[model samples]
Target: GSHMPVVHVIDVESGNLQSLTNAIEHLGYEVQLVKSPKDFNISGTSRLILPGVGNYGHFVDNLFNRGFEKPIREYIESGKPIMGICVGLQALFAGSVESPKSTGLNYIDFKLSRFDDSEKPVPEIGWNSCIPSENLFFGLDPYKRYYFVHSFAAILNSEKKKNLENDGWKIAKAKYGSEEFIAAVNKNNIFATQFHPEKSGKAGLNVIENFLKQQSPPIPNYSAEEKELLMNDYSNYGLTRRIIACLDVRTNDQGDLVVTKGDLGKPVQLAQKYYQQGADEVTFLNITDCPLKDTPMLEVLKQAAKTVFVPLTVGGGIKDIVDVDGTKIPALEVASLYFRSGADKVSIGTDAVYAAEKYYELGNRGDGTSPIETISKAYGAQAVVISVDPKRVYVNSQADTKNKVFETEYPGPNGEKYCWYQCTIKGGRESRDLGVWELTRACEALGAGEILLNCIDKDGSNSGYDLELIEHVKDAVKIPVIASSGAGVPEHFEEAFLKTRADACLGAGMFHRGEFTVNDVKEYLLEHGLKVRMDEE
Candidate 1:
């Protein structure tokens, strides 16, 4: 019985804990979530795993405040096998630019730095290869890949570089650009990774199995010629198109949190149902009238994330400040709460427009202080989504409108020749002078990674997606766009993908009303010669 592997995971009240817990328990091991160092009695546990997601500053501060710093350092010194994942790995470093004032645990001498992406996109989402150092990856083969989502990485200094060259602590290597960073490190019984093995699917499970079984990686059996051949191909794998389910959540008249399809529905049930149907992702939007007081939506995200494994993006009512019973709460903290509740990404609708307006007003120079920029900087840009609620305003001629306008393929109800999408706030109740095209481009420049293109005119009509609106916004930005707000049939999804350059399409009513399952849409897309991640089950 003593030989059974019992893993103790330290929870710092951050993101992705439920997924990690699920992964560990799925391995047929006893897993315990230890909150404070006082409860982290290491005698019964075979190993320690630290997992977290959020700002580095807040993480380090929590570590010290929760009395985990000293105990973790002592455990590492004891050499009983310990591991860290993602931000957990970052905390094991000396420090990071994400948190300039706070210091890390310094388990290793290296410092984490932001990925240099002047030539390419940063955050580096999707699967990528890690050139292994032989003994670290026992059951894995050459060119084995893992999912990575991070902005800051730990690069070895000159001294550590010499040590790695001389056969020291290094175990695996990965590169972001021209700069190579340490992907995985092993020193004595200490193991850590910059990637999330829990969310990486089957291969990641194998890695966790190897570590839990305390198996040593086998010696390399390849010739020098073969080694050289393997080293040449270390680029990222291809990324596929995604299909997301949007859950527009709001409190009903009885004051219950529910997902509204046409009027009302269940938030948790639909989320899990969609996950089982093989949705690439799920999104939750809180369309509450009084968003500052609608704290129940956070709990909804928490419950949904526990059952749904795919990426989750949440939106609505996110602002820079909230008055909580007359006390001011920073929007960054509010966003962090969403992340802690298992939101993979947070979409800013009204706040994004405000941020962009302020950004352009300041001569198009962002000081990196806004909510969108701050969140993007801490959690990579790919995790920041901009939700655009635009209404088409038709005009006879472009000269009549001062805002950016586009010529529509079809005339408006008023027989207008041209239209400009008007950006709106307060759940599309208030109009702004900003155009959808201009707002999307500016938001991307200000650090939005994806656009949730929502059309108020076509929202519930379900005639089809607004292909003209989708194209107008999608073509305006280099980032990915999610065509949203109108889908009555599966063919509507196909039209959105085929007509415009949308990377994904979202629907609420069609899926909620049993008109089509997520698989129904994927099957249609596959038959239409489009690529989609099929349901493994």
Candidate 2:
């Protein structure tokens, strides 16, 4: 294994490639993070993996700015195998609608277009099946599912097909909304995938092995029953719905990090309690303006991580990499501290909205170094969630509002015709010109893995989830949606899932008030026929 050839992963300042790099190394190959074209020594390189996250336009800019465009093209022409993943795959095309300011390498003759959710759901996140229309990788399962987190896809036109015909490019395609797009393509030494094989679990490892020309490993040592369990690992657990427990944490008058319930308890204590109650994930949001490193929150998170076995997400006040004294710090470095302290994912709120605004103002030529994109690239997109605090703005007509509007399920206080949700930051203490829909789309295009949809109007209200808000946001983006804000009863959880395609629902009030346990909600979801993790039971 030590004699394995080296795989160079291009670090073109695009959002995170750690998952891709780790996956390659896990397969016994040496991985080198190639920073610039000058350091892209090809003499001893086995293969090159161009894995990227974040804005397609930003990715293209980095490619040319760092002189990777020529070397990438040269490597492909050198007849060495090179695989472009996600935006990496899109970068091999002519151009993309996401980033019009920059141009792709045009190695392929097709243009990338955003998924039209009008006919199909977009930002097409989660696991999807890739149907092999051509035999590029032998012994690879045609129906194996791969993880995809992208808004734009490469469409092969007649001219592209004519180009493919001469090169005999083997293509694998998949249907997203109403159209089939190229999922994977292989021609000679050029290989590219629209999906992330790195995050695809065991099936993904097989695909990686195939690309590396490595022989399949020896048959499993497990018995027939255990073999079934092995395959079920990727299929069953990967698709199961999650139940998240949220803790609105803050520093009390004693200057100690504590969980809410009138701020009478420690966060670590409450987190462990929720874990025992069968929570699939735990979220701790710094509701106060306390700095993460300066406060005892990291210690609380560290203690909780030792006891809690579920996914943990931490948010609030992560604007940028800054010290308690207001000194500049890298966002990635800040995220690293949280990860080291046991956070599975870091949620971005105001920072993400600001990043989104800058993304739009720049005409989609986003700041690749922004906190949201940079953190996602350093970690994976799945490790970053965008928490949106939107306030409802009622309008008599769509034209009366500048933002996108949706018809409400019920009349507003003043009986408005339609309403648009305006984005807000600083715990809803401030408002921005951007709409919720616009922010969601922009963040997804930038690199947000999931959306934690919260309603400022419904915050702390014992009514129910903002179903209208949840429905609209879920339809707006293809990423997994988590409904938050209100949860007065078990029926509220059922309502959120039944009303929208929300992947998860989070609640703090009901659980904190001792009204119901986490298991009570899961039991209700199970009885109601919703798929959820039932391991703790």
Candidate 3:
């Protein structure tokens, strides 16, 4: 806690750092978000928070990849104030396991184990009372209840546990199944709780504020900066032109191939192939209403995240305030798991359309004030994209018989006439007369990075893209537009990119059936004089 306490947050897989950082900021602190541990500089008396959520191997691997192995060990050796929350706390130890139970960092020489009691159930979800340890809760209450949502805890022995030598560490335990396990810990200046201070309302805020209030003594050897470079040889745009591969998860009648309006197979396999073919990113649409039915779909996503080297964005069926239930996990948990598994971002479509207000309230993803923005700041803007399928506006609220009317153009016997396209959920079953253009613009204005424009008529045809509809979108917004549906040939892509000046082209049927892999399109683009990002590897 200095004049300007720069909070260095280490990103890992188990925890939602985005939500945690957002909650902390809500408590009033300007946070400097860092994607890698190497990005942190210990120049001043700053506070370090190690947060995590996910498997032990993944948590360790990601931290190692971010180059935090030594720096973290060094930071801990210095005895400065450091805090770990949730998975962040568990990750501090040498290691821990989920199914079989494993080891942790062993930094504090404690046993990190899972709650194996089946009768009591594992994954301690929700708030629980913490028997405070004097090491960290010097001025706080000993029996205060803080929000907790984890199964593993740091059980320190009498000799190893140095900070809080109180009953809180010894007796202050939440049960796995009648077995009192360690809930919170404090050894020297290092403090951590199994509960999330960010989501705990007032108690959580107080905990962080209390942690920040404590000061640390200055130390020498404020390590030197390394590896700085500047290059002007290549032209860089104001924003990066992201290349995203689109995969819609639908089953073919044969049941072997994945399909859009036609056929495609396993979104994960398609994503890996796309990455291999030099796609900057990949997106998945689980168009199925009952996504839970296809358990393999998630495994496919997990495989893509684990293997794919680029960002992964997914959408379809996400709606409303994400309820954080243990069994019924929130979409954010899925999103975090995707990220941990290797996805850089997750895109939401119908969810955004239906829960626009909720997203808006949790916050806009631009100014770093909104919950959505928190995600972008924690995961990078390139990681978040909103897929909006909008229809052209033809009528106002009062003009229609219903409360409002959104219409599309229909070709009559004489000429084209304005009619409602009727936006439908569950793959176009229930129709709502809402203007696609209006909805798309509203979402973009609400801080969506890109739009996946799908022309329903052209969806399965693969005849070509709907240039007229694209013209309307491009003319109205500055964000990147993904022209989806209707890619019968390579020439269609050319026309969409060259003539329409679209940002990107996405199609499932074409790529799935060997029409054109992402590589083929990129090669064609390079041959055709269009600029595209290609991996040297």
Task: Tell me, by TM-score, which candidate is best.
Answer: 1
Q: Write the per-residue lDDT of candidate 3 for residues 1-537, one digit (tens) a residue.
A: 344456777765343354456545655666766667557766543678887654555566677777776777778777777887765677666666442344456654454766543433234433344432333362233323344444456554455443435423422344333445566666676777676665444445567777776732222222332101111111112111234567777666765436455552367677768777766556777654234424445556656644454445667543323333325644554555555544444676655555444433456333333324444333333334666554443443334433223233544444434433334444555455444554455555554556677787787798998887776676555555778888867678778876784666776677767777777876776567544444422
Models, CA RMSD each: 5.8, 7.9, 19.3
Q: Is candidate 1 or candidate 3 better by TM-score?
A: 1
lDDT of each: 0.73, 0.72, 0.55
Estimate, for each residue in 1-537, the C-alpha lDDT of model 2 and write its tens digit. 347778888887434344466567767788878888776676656688887765677667877888887778778878888888887888888888777766888867668887765644445655555553446453344434566667678765567666776878777766655556788877788778887676455566667767777332433355665433323132222333456788878867766666653442477788878878867678998765456575566666667755464557899755565566787878777777776566767899888878988988899867797888887765556668999998888989888977889998788888896988999887788999888999998898887878999977787787888888988887678667888888878888888877766767888878877788888997897677655554431
Instruction: Locate the minimum summed-lDDT window of 10 residues in model 3.
Output: 226-235
Q: Tell me the tens digit of each residue's lDDT in model 1 across 349-428.
A: 88887877787788877878777888776665777889899888899898988877888888878798899888998778
TM-score of 3: 0.49
Q: Once model 2 is optimally superposed onto the true structure by TM-score, how far is the C-alpha of residue 11 displaced, in angstroms?
A: 1.7
Lowest-scoring 10 consecutive residues by lDDT in candidate 2? 229-238
Total clashing pairs for each candidate: 0, 4, 29
- Among these predictions, the greatest lDDT belongs to 1
lDDT of 2: 0.72
